[PDB]
Structure formats: structure tokens, C-alpha cells
Ligand binder design. Structure first.
Ligand SMILES: *[C@@H]1O[C@H](CO)[C@@H](O)[C@H](O)[C@H]1NC(C)=O
Ligand SMILES: Nc1ncnc2[nH]cnc12
Length: 246
């Protein structure tokens, strides 16, 4: 499957990892030239395993649902960890079976619950490659409060980067120095399901959105996306959540 090493990492090797991540996700269709994620996949094939190595070369393996890029759980050493949600519970039937013990985290995997658990919102959590290195290290030694913050970092630097070229670039820019995400980054993370839906509805509507998506731009101004000619659609989003899953 897919792998990333913090040791010796630079914007280029990180770019390569995110390309591999994207390429690991199956699709039979591109909508407006953007891969469309499958409505569903049955069995173990539903889950991609990412091998992540911290600077010291310690590893965790992260389980990702290939239909939505949602992290379900991870394996650190001989212990598996899964979010407290039905979908992750299902995932546990298929991944890291050979783990000696299984811990269920005291929270689900969505941003609202993770931010509560961590004690701070994504806006205040620095991200980048050094932050990912830290996050890997944290997840290696169970601590549920610290893990929440680690998971917010991990999620944004893997799944959200795969979904948006702008987020990938934000992280490449933070290769050697962490920084809290721009509001544009937060906006995009928030809008993924909504943009995926509207890009899909745009087919058979002459590339026009049924409902406009309000984003925040790089310069910090609130903009609305109304059609597929927008740069968000042509030059940013890289994966579409299948409408069947919305
Ligand atoms: C499509 O969106 C652009 C902004 O990106 C806007 O200027 C244009 O008016 C829109 N076109 C239509 C047909 O709505
Ligand atoms: N658990 C998760 N995995 C991937 N992306 C997410 N966005 C919010 N929660 C997420």
C-alpha cells in the first residue's frame, strides 16, 4: 500500500506520498476530470493501510476507508486503536486482526468531537511535517487527550491533503516549520462533502451548481463557488465523495 517517511522528508517526497495516497483510492469514473470515489466496497478491500514513519523510524499503520478517505483507526506496535463510531467498529473486523489488544478511543472521528477531546479547535493547532512527525510519536504511546490533537494533525496532513491540492501545498509550505491552517484550509475541509455533491449535480445542469458553496479564499475573503469553471473545481479538489454517501 502507501508509505511516508519523516526522516529525510521534503516537499517533494511528501508530494509523492500524497500522489500515492490518491492513486490508491479506486474509482471507475471521473466527473469533470476529478476521480469519483466508489459508492461502496465490500470486505477488507474497503480499507487502505498507510505506513507512516516518524523521524526515528518508528511506525504506525493507519486504516483509511477508500470510499471517503476517513481514517478509522491505526495500529501502533501491537495495539490497535479505533474511533468510537459504528463505521470504525466495522473496520475493526477487517484490519489489524493480529493485534494483541484493541483500544476504542473515547471519541468518534469527526472534527467537532476531536476538537472537544483535544481542548482546542483546528484553527489553533499548528500543522506541517514536523507536526506530523510529533503526531506519529504521540499515537505510539496511548494518551487519549494528546491523541485527539495528534489525530487532527494526522487527518489534515494525509486525508485533507489528498482531497485538495491547496491543502497539500499548505503542508509542503510547512515542511520545516509548523503553522496553524489558513482559514481557506479550514473552509475547504468543511466543504468537501458539499463541493463533491454540487460538482456531481453540475453534470446534467451544464456545469452549474444547484446550490452555491461559500468558501474563504487564500487572501482571506469570503467567496462563493457557483459553477465548475471555478479554480476550486478545475485546479484544487482531487477526489469526490460519491453522492450516494452524502
Ligand atoms: C461561474 O463562476 C464565475 C466565478 O468563478 C463567475 O464569474 C461566472 O459568472 C459564473 N458563470 C455562470 C454561468 O454562472
Ligand atoms: N476521521 C476523519 N478522517 C478523514 N477526514 C476527516 N474529516 C473529519 N474527520 C475525519
Amino acid at each position: 500500500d502507501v508509505s511516508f517517511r519523516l526522516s529525510g522528508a521534503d516537499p517533494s517526497s511528501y508530494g509523492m506520498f500524497i500522489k500515492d495516497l490518491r492513486n490508491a483510492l479506486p474509482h471507475t469514473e471521473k466527473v469533470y476530470n476529478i476521480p469519483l470515489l466508489l459508492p461502496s466496497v465490500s470486505g477488507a478491500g474497503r480499507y487502505l493501510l498507510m505506513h507512516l514513519f516518524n523521524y526515528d523510524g518508528n511506525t504506525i499503520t493507519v486504516a483509511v476507508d477508500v470510499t471517503n478517505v476517513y481514517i478509522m483507526g491505526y495500529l501502533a506496535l501491537t495495539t490497535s486503536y479505533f474511533f468510537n463510531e459504528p463505521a470504525a467498529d466495522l473496520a475493526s473486523q477487517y484490519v489489524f486482526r493480529s493485534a494483541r489488544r484493541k483500544i476504542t478511543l473515547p471519541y468518534s472521528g469527526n472534527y467537532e468531537r476531536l476538537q472537544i477531546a483535544a481542548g482546542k479547535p483546528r484553527e489553533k493547532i499548528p500543522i506541517g511535517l514536523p507536526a506530523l512527525d510529533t503526531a506519529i510519536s504521540t499515537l505510539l504511546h496511548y494518551d487519549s487527550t494528546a491523541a485527539a490533537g495528534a489525530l487532527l494533525v494526522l487527518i489534515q496532513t494525509t486525508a485533507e491533503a489528498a482531497r485538495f491540492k491547496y491543502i497539500e501545498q499548505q503542508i509542503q509550505e510547512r515542511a520545516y516549520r509548523d503553522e496553524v491552517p489558513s482559514s481557506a484550509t479550514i473552509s475547504l475541509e468543511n466543504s468537501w462533502s458539499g463541493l463533491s455533491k454540487q460538482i456531481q449535480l453540475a453534470q446534467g445542469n451544464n456545469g452549474v451548481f444547484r446550490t452555491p458553496t461559500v468558501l474563504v479564499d487564500s487572501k482571506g475573503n469570503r467567496v462563493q463557488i457557483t459553477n465548475v469553471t471555478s479554480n476550486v473545481v478545475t485546479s484544487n479538489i482531487q477526489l469526490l465523495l460519491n453522492t450516494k454517501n452524502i
